[PDB]
């Protein structure tokens, strides 16, 4: 029973960062070689575990979190980072044990007129707790006057779309990111290496 890593990594359509997708890998055999023997990843950073030892370890569960962000924001997907993506879209714990993998997606997620289906949360009062998912579309209140569900001055929609055009710079270009988190609990171990 091979673990379905390709379902996350080789998927046609990815998710927005404000609605990052999570898949639970359980009860399967995982070969991480396919991940650490590939040359298609711009970013491959594993915190708290080396990739080489990953095939020799057993875990209770694995979590694959996939989303699409900008290149300049890929640095925010790391322990102890600050920024719009880290604070309001996707927060990694300071004591994070897992692998962040990221590749360029200008060929698939950048369109000549601009791809406006990818969105990020722009306005939020408080920073996001680790592994939190805010999907609220409530109008943000920037002042004393209530919004009453109507956009206006000091009353803004919380989500803004990336302008993903193929002529953009690498920093403004889209990047697909998968975060692997390995969990071990006082429960039977279901994810094991070869």
């Amino acid at each position: 029973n091979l673990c379905p890593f390709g379902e996350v990594f080789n998927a046609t359509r990815f998710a927005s960062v404000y609605a990052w997708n999570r898949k639970r890998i359980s009860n399967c055999v995982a070969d991480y070689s396919v991940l650490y023997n590939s040359a298609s990843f711009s970013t491959f950073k594993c915190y708290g575990v080396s990739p080489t030892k990953l095939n020799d370890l057993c875990f209770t569960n694995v979590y694959a979190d996939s989303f699409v962000i900008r290149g300049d924001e890929v640095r925010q997907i790391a322990p102890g980072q600050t920024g719009k993506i880290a604070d309001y879209n996707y927060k990694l714990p300071d004591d994070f044990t897992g692998c962040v993998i990221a590749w360029n997606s200008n060929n698939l997620d950048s369109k000549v007129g601009g791809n406006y289906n990818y969105l990020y949360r722009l306005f939020r009062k408080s920073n996001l707790k680790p592994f939190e998912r805010d999907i609220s579309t409530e109008i943000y209140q920037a002042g004393s006057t209530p919004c009453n569900g109507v956009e206006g001055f000091n009353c803004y929609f919380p989500l803004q779309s990336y302008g993903f055009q193929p002529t953009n710079g690498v920093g403004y270009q889209p990047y697909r990111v998968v975060v692997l988190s390995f969990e071990l609990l006082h429960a039977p171990a279901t994810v094991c290496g070869p």
Partner: nanobody
Amino acid sequence: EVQLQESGGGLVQPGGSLRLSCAASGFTFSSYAMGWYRQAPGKEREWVCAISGSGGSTYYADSVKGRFTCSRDNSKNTLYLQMNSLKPEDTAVYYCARVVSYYDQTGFVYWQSYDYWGQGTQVTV
């Protein structure tokens, strides 16, 4: 991460022994691994050492391995870098900050610094 002061010494003879100290406040010192960053005059900043919160894993660069020892006392929230067998190439300014480590695709370990700063000045070591 409210502040990080530094101490330890200045001008010192070659082949000598001296220890450099860093203080911390505003966070759990034992929770976060701390590292020493050395910036040479006219050269780029260089990571010399990194120590975990426990101290059970200490990492040193090949440029200085076998001579400097990095220690921490979580009781006083202080960071120590003991410098022995000193050579004129070790002449630089030293800085401390919270640090994190990652493994690349080929298994090698690199270090990333939490965005902050410690202010100090050294002119000879």
